[PDB]
């Protein structure tokens, strides 16, 4: 695919709710005509972004001409956040170059909607628990109390449980591995003999 | 004109290791108004031990 005039962003996969970061939005032009762009982004209540270079109007970008802007933003919500960026062209602004037609298709404005991830702020740390239950033709029970909310933040708390029996995780490879021919001294003879 | 020349060098280019052998230093002073150069061979056996 392609687009004669589009907008692409850059940002990491995941971020942290507390600290901020910049979001780098580039715009690219491949049509011969050289046009000033109106670029920006619509934002949600689930974070807070601010520009760095908003006051100044861009001038123009020509074929293979790419401009770029940024936005210093801090997330608020947790998980996945869609980020929306709108870019379009402008007519009757012949101040950068010779002409500026600025007449694209019905979708003349690139309106891209991109998500990202954010993890919960604070030093992530864990807690482990284990249990071996074996009803030998019968019933057994247990109870496990999970409570460590000192100086914590809501909803970072997660847990999970896993049921299995783990003798077979390595019972394949090692078992089929070591079955060998005896030879050598009595020491080596035992070495090769005993394990089997 | 007065005194003598100095220089502090770095041995990273020398790789003071197994298979790079002893250190020969050949210093060549070209005295002006004669073009006259003379050399001294020095410290060939700096024991990189």
């Amino acid at each position: 695919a392609f687009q004669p005039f589009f907008v692409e962003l850059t940002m990491p996969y995941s971020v942290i709710r507390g600290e901020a970061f910049t979001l780098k939005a580039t715009v690219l032009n491949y049509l011969p005509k050289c046009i000033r762009v109106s670029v920006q982004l619509e934002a949600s209540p689930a974070f807070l972004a601010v520009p760095v270079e908003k006051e100044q109007a861009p001038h123009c970008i020509c074929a293979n001409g790419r401009q770029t802007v940024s936005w210093a933003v801090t997330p608020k919500s947790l998980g996945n956040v869609n980020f929306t960026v709108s870019a379009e062209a402008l007519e009757s602004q012949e101040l950068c170059g010779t002409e500026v037609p600025s007449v694209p298709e019905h979708g003349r404005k690139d309106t891209v909607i991109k998500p990202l991830l954010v993890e919960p702020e604070g030093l992530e740390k864990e807690t482990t628990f284990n249990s071996l239950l074996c009803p030998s033709g019968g019933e057994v029970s247990e109870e496990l109390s999970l409570k460590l909310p000192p100086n914590v933040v809501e909803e970072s708390a997660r847990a999970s449980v896993s049921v299995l029996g783990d003798i077979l995780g390595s019972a394949m490879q090692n078992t089929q591995n070591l079955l060998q021919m005896p030879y050598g001294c009595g020491e080596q003879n035992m070495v090769l003999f005993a394990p089997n | 004109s007065h005194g003598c020349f100095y220089q502090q060098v770095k041995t990273k280019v020398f790789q003071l290791k197994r298979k790079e052998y002893e250190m020969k230093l050949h210093t060549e002073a070209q005295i002006q108004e004669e073009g006259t150069v003379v050399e001294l061979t020095g410290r060939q056996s700096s024991e990189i031990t």
Partner: protein
């Protein structure tokens, strides 16, 4: 969990290859296990965990 030799062998030691000291950690952890598993009537629950 597990256990080691005393977190490093105290005297001057090592230089690789486990010289006169095969590091004997899997064997001893397994001996610990076999101890944990042993019981006349039947073992308990906690030793199993």
């Amino acid at each position: 969990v597990h256990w080691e030799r005393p977190q490093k062998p105290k005297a001057p030691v090592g230089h690789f290859y486990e010289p006169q000291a095969p590091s004997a950690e899997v064997e001893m952890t397994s001996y610990v296990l076999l101890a944990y598993l042993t019981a006349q009537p039947a073992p308990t629950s906690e030793d199993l965990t």
